[PDB]
Design an enzyme around this catalytic site. Structure first.
Site, PDB file in Angstrom:
ATOM      1  N   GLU A  57      16.304 -64.019  77.658  1.00  0.00           N
ATOM      2  CA  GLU A  57      14.939 -63.577  77.967  1.00  0.00           C
ATOM      3  C   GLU A  57      14.698 -63.269  79.432  1.00  0.00           C
ATOM      4  O   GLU A  57      13.739 -62.562  79.782  1.00  0.00           O
ATOM      5  CB  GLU A  57      13.921 -64.609  77.498  1.00  0.00           C
ATOM      6  CG  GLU A  57      13.828 -64.720  75.958  1.00  0.00           C
ATOM      7  CD  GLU A  57      13.470 -63.401  75.273  1.00  0.00           C
ATOM      8  OE1 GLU A  57      12.477 -62.760  75.677  1.00  0.00           O
ATOM      9  OE2 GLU A  57      14.175 -62.997  74.323  1.00  0.00           O
ATOM     10  N   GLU A  66       7.966 -60.828  84.225  1.00  0.00           N
ATOM     11  CA  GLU A  66       8.151 -59.690  83.356  1.00  0.00           C
ATOM     12  C   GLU A  66       8.317 -58.427  84.207  1.00  0.00           C
ATOM     13  O   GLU A  66       7.527 -58.186  85.114  1.00  0.00           O
ATOM     14  CB  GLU A  66       6.927 -59.586  82.462  1.00  0.00           C
ATOM     15  CG  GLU A  66       6.912 -58.341  81.606  1.00  0.00           C
ATOM     16  CD  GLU A  66       5.839 -58.383  80.556  1.00  0.00           C
ATOM     17  OE1 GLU A  66       5.084 -59.387  80.502  1.00  0.00           O
ATOM     18  OE2 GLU A  66       5.773 -57.422  79.763  1.00  0.00           O
ATOM     19  N   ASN A 104      -1.735 -68.465  75.107  1.00  0.00           N
ATOM     20  CA  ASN A 104      -0.540 -69.307  75.278  1.00  0.00           C
ATOM     21  C   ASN A 104      -0.551 -70.083  76.592  1.00  0.00           C
ATOM     22  O   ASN A 104      -0.095 -71.227  76.634  1.00  0.00           O
ATOM     23  CB  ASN A 104       0.746 -68.491  75.156  1.00  0.00           C
ATOM     24  CG  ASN A 104       1.076 -68.142  73.718  1.00  0.00           C
ATOM     25  OD1 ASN A 104       0.841 -68.934  72.795  1.00  0.00           O
ATOM     26  ND2 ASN A 104       1.643 -66.956  73.520  1.00  0.00           N
TER      27      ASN A 104
END
Ligand code: ZN
Ligand code: ZN
Length: 204
Positions: A57, A66, A104
């Site tokens: 990831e 990201e 989240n």
């Protein structure tokens, strides 16, 4: 911890120096069952599975945030009564599991006793917090799957279920055979390093 510092070092030779072994070990107390449930074989399979998924990831821990910045404003679920107080574009992926979405950050923060909804940058600025969010996801979330990755490894459902739960929706079910194989290969290398068998049901 069933992964030593020297093993962790070999697992992630290209890592951003942000990601520290000491941060990871500090995080473990949030989930004392993690890599500490079942036989030493299972403990090591679990640790390897977590770290292999993390490698996938984050590009071998090279990346903290990201990389596709165009996607940043996407992670605000405006239906939440608590909204996106840090900003509409401030809930992008951060840390070992690329924690994303206001809801989240809210859930993870509530579980960890940290105000991540109002301070989401903590996940990119503090190693222990970053690792704690990874362990929160691993130990409590099913994601696009049906079980927690922790449960998959301890109960013997296998590594493939962890792929499904960790950003595997476009890869499992024949979606991306190359990415699935790459993820399995990394898990096999990490189990080999730890000196344990990978177990069954590796794919999804
Ligand atoms: Zn499916
Ligand atoms: Zn992937």
């Amino acid at each position: 911890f069933v992964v030593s510092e020297a093993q962790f070092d070999q697992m992630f030779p290209s890592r951003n120096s942000f990601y520290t072994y000491s941060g990871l070990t500090a995080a473990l107390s949030a989930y004392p069952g993690f890599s500490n449930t079942g036989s030493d074989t299972v403990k090591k399979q679990e640790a390897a599975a977590f770290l292999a998924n993390v490698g996938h990831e984050t590009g071998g821990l090279v990346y903290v945030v990201e990389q596709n910045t165009a996607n940043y404003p996407h992670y605000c679920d405006a239906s939440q009564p608590y909204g996106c107080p840090a900003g509409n574009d401030k809930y992008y992926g951060r840390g070992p599991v690329q924690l994303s979405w206001n809801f989240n950050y809210k859930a993870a923060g509530d579980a960890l006793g940290i105000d991540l909804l109002n301070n989401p940058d903590l996940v990119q600025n503090d190693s222990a917090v970053a690792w704690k969010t990874g362990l929160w996801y691993w130990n409590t979330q099913t994601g696009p799957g049906t079980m927690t990755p922790h449960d998959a490894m301890v109960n013997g459902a296998g590594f493939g279920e962890t792929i499904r739960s960790i950003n595997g929706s476009l890869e499992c079910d024949g979606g991306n055979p190359g990415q699935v194989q790459s993820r399995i290969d990394n898990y096999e290398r990490f189990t080999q390093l730890l000196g344990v068998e990978p177990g069954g049901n590796l794919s999804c």
